[PDB]
C-alpha cells in the first residue's frame, strides 16, 4: 500500500464500488490488483481519506499516475 494503512476499516465507506469499507473491494472480480489483494483500507497520503486500495488501483490508471493510486472520494 502507498497510503497509511489502517489496522481497521473506518466508517467512510468505499467510494469506488460504493460498498462498506469493512466488506472488501467490489471490483475484486475484475481488477488489475498488483499487491492490494482485495482487503486493504488505506487513506491516500495526498488528501488522507479512505477507500478500498484495490478499487482505487483500478481507476487509478486514469489519474495520480506515479506508483500508487488516486483518491476516488475527492478525486485526489
Ligand atoms: Zn470499493
Ligand atoms: Zn480525497
Swiss-Prot record:
ZnF bounds (RING-type): 14-75
Subcellular location per the Swiss-Prot or TrEMBL entry: Cytoplasm; Nucleus
Transmembrane segments: none
Domain notes: The WWE domains are thought to mediate some protein-protein interaction, and are frequently found in ubiquitin ligases.
Subunit structure, as described in the record: Homodimer. May form a heterodimer with other members of the Deltex family. Interacts with NOTCH1.
Function noted in UniProt: Regulator of Notch signaling, a signaling pathway involved in cell-cell communications that regulates a broad spectrum of cell-fate determinations. Probably acts both as a positive and negative regulator of Notch, depending on the developmental and cell context. Mediates the antineural activity of Notch, possibly by inhibiting the transcriptional activation mediated by MATCH1. Functions as a ubiquitin ligase protein in vitro, suggesting that it may regulate the Notch pathway via some ubiquitin ligase activity.
Family of this protein: Belongs to the Deltex family.
The protein's name: Probable E3 ubiquitin-protein ligase DTX2
Organism the protein comes from: Homo sapiens
Gene name of the encoded protein: DTX2
Residue range from the parent sequence: 399 to 474 of 622
